[PDB]
Structures are given as structure tokens and as C-alpha cells.
Design an enzyme around this catalytic site. Structure first.
Site, mmCIF file in Angstrom:
data_model
loop_
_atom_site.group_PDB
_atom_site.id
_atom_site.type_symbol
_atom_site.label_atom_id
_atom_site.label_comp_id
_atom_site.label_asym_id
_atom_site.label_seq_id
_atom_site.Cartn_x
_atom_site.Cartn_y
_atom_site.Cartn_z
ATOM 1 C CB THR A 165 -59.310 19.112 60.823
ATOM 2 O OG1 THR A 165 -59.493 18.565 59.984
ATOM 3 C CG2 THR A 165 -58.754 18.405 61.678
ATOM 4 C CG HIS B 126 -55.686 17.016 56.182
ATOM 5 N ND1 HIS B 126 -57.026 18.381 56.279
ATOM 6 C CD2 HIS B 126 -56.440 16.452 56.553
ATOM 7 C CE1 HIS B 126 -58.045 17.814 56.697
ATOM 8 N NE2 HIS B 126 -57.696 16.643 57.120
ATOM 9 C CD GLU C 99 -55.710 19.468 58.520
ATOM 10 O OE1 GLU C 99 -56.889 17.907 59.772
ATOM 11 O OE2 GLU C 99 -56.790 20.163 58.045
ATOM 12 C CG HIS D 139 -59.804 13.277 54.364
ATOM 13 N ND1 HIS D 139 -60.891 12.306 55.540
ATOM 14 C CD2 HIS D 139 -58.835 13.699 55.439
ATOM 15 C CE1 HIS D 139 -60.471 12.674 56.970
ATOM 16 N NE2 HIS D 139 -59.551 13.858 56.230
ATOM 17 C CG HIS E 10 -56.974 12.972 59.062
ATOM 18 N ND1 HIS E 10 -57.878 14.009 58.946
ATOM 19 C CD2 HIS E 10 -56.354 12.836 60.061
ATOM 20 C CE1 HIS E 10 -56.748 14.968 59.951
ATOM 21 N NE2 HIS E 10 -55.917 14.074 60.289
ATOM 22 C CG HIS F 105 -62.954 20.961 50.992
ATOM 23 N ND1 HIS F 105 -63.544 22.291 50.999
ATOM 24 C CD2 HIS F 105 -64.921 20.920 51.056
ATOM 25 C CE1 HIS F 105 -64.709 22.790 50.754
ATOM 26 N NE2 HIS F 105 -65.235 21.481 51.471
HETATM 27 ZN ZN LIG Z 1 -59.001 15.445 58.210
#
Ligand SMILES: [Zn+2]
EC number: 4.2.1.1
Length: 257
Positions: free
Chosen positions: A195, A93, A103, A91, A116, A61
Site C-alpha cells: 500500500t 497506518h 487502509e 508497522h 501490518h 512514512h
Molecule cells: Zn502497511
């Protein structure tokens, strides 16, 4: 299983994780005119000098840079927080295009990516206990925009070749997460969630106002990762973001005027 495709993406998650439609879901749009300056928020304390990175993992992911959280080596405190939160991993996104990937949004503006930095409350002893508590985690969210390179990110970019596919890890020692922080620690804060499934409502979000700049070449390397395992059909790891969720009965507070 859950993911970011047409058949298993964010609009589907509520079937296996009903808290997806809960009262304190993340991310949210940050309406900068409605956020209230809170003069009582204490100073924010990011103490990463003794951080010990261990490993980088492609979990199918995103990729996680993991830290030794067995002692108080890298801690977040102050701001809206009571007590001491230990860094466990960071990590990102990101998008398929520079116009999307974050996000959180700011006045509906989407950034190219969002970092994050995940921390857990030491009063709960371990990460698995902490995610069961409403004050278990503190996530420091930092926006990425495409412009100048971030020198402190290049060590991450250069290892991604070695963790292209789901389940691959590599040794990742002596990485200094101070190289990923903007100049200003001015922030917005609100109570929310992970999230990603299981979408647990355990997060105090701390979203920095000042983005960091990364280069087009740096984010292109994020977009060459794969969601799939080795020797499976190639599916580029892009658009691994959840869109903004309803704010409901929550107030976003600003650390700054
Ligand atoms: Zn995250």
C-alpha cells in the site's frame, strides 16, 4: 518524493509508480456480503513464540518494528498460503481523528488504524527477491478501534518519544508481537499489493475480522510522531493511509461462515 500531503499523496503516486493503477492494488473495501466462505482454506498458523525483535525505526512514512529474519523464528503459514513466510517487520497506518486511519475498510467502515505484520516467502531467500514475485509476501492486517488500552502495545507507545523524527532508530529487543493479536484468527484473504510505493503486486493479504482495542492515549502518541527530520518544520505523522482501490478482477474469500 512521495508522501501523504496535497502535492505528493496517493492521487500523485501513479506518476512515479505507474502500477498504482494496476490490476491487483491494495487496500480494498471488504464487502462482507460478497466475500465467499471458502471451506477449503487450511488452518492459519501464526507461530511467534521465538520472535526476535531488534529495532524500531521512523522511516518518514511510519515506524517499523524490525525482527531477525535470518532464521525461521517467527513464521506465518497455512490459511491461503503455500510454504513458510518469515516475519520481517510490522508497522501501522493511522488517522488524525479516530474516524479514519485504516487502509482496508469493511462495508465502507474506516477503523482508527491498521497494523501490518509483514512476512516474506522463504522459497525466495530474502525480502528483496520476494517482492518481485506474485506470491512473495504475506501481510497480516489487523484493525485498531479506540476503546480499552492494549497492554501489549504500550512498550511500542513508550519508545516513540525516542524516534520522533525521520531517520531516528532505537534498540527494541524482546518485544512479543503475540500481544498485538485479537482472540479470533477468522480472516478475509485476497491477492493485492504493498500500500506504499513501490506498490508491488506481491502480497497475499490476510485481514483479520476481529479488531483490537487501543486507548485514546495510545493512538495520541502515534499522532505526536513527525514525518519530518530533526530541525525541519514539524509535520505531524498522521493520515499515513492509502484509500481503497478498485477490486477489478478479484474475489475476497472468507475463512468463516
Ligand atoms: Zn502497511
Amino acid at each position: 518524493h512521495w508522501g501523504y500531503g496535497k502535492h505528493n499523496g496517493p492521487e500523485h503516486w501513479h506518476k512515479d509508480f505507474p502500477i498504482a493503477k494496476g490490476e491487483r492494488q491494495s487496500p480494498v473495501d471488504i464487502d462482507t456480503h460478497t466475500a465467499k466462505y471458502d471451506p477449503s482454506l487450511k488452518p492459519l498458523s501464526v507461530s511467534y513464540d521465538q520472535a526476535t525483535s531488534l529495532r524500531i525505526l521512523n522511516n518518514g512514512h511510519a515506524f517499523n518494528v524490525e525482527f531477525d529474519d535470518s532464521q525461521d523464528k517467527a513464521v506465518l503459514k497455512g490459511g491461503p498460503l503455500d510454504g513458510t513466510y518469515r516475519l520481517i517487520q510490522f508497522h501501522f497506518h493511522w488517522g488524525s481523528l479516530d474516524g479514519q486511519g485504516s487502509e482496508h475498510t469493511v462495508d465502507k467502515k474506516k477503523y482508527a488504524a491498521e497494523l501490518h505484520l509483514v512476512h516474506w516467502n522463504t522459497k525466495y531467500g530474502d525480502f528483496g527477491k520476494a517482492v518481485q514475485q506474485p506470491d512473495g509476501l504475506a501481510v497480516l492486517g489487523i484493525f485498531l478501534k479506540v476503546g480499552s488500552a492494549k497492554p501489549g502495545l504500550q512498550k511500542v507507545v513508550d519508545v516513540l518519544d525516542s524516534i520522533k523524527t525521520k531517520g531516528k532508530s532505537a534498540d527494541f529487543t524482546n518485544f512479543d508481537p503475540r500481544g498485538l493479536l485479537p482472540e479470533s484468527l477468522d480472516y478475509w484473504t485476497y491477492p493485492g499489493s504493498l500500500t506504499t510505493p513501490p506498490l508491488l503486486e506481491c502480497v497475499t493479504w490476510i485481514v483479520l475480522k476481529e479488531p483490537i482495542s487501543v486507548s485514546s492515549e495510545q493512538v495520541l502518541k502515534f499522532r505526536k510522531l513527525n514525518f519530518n527530520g530533526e530541525g525541519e518544520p514539524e509535520e505531524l505523522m498522521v493520515d499515513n493511509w492509502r484509500p481503497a482501490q478498485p477490486l477489478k478482477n478479484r474475489q475476497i474469500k472468507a475463512s468463516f461462515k
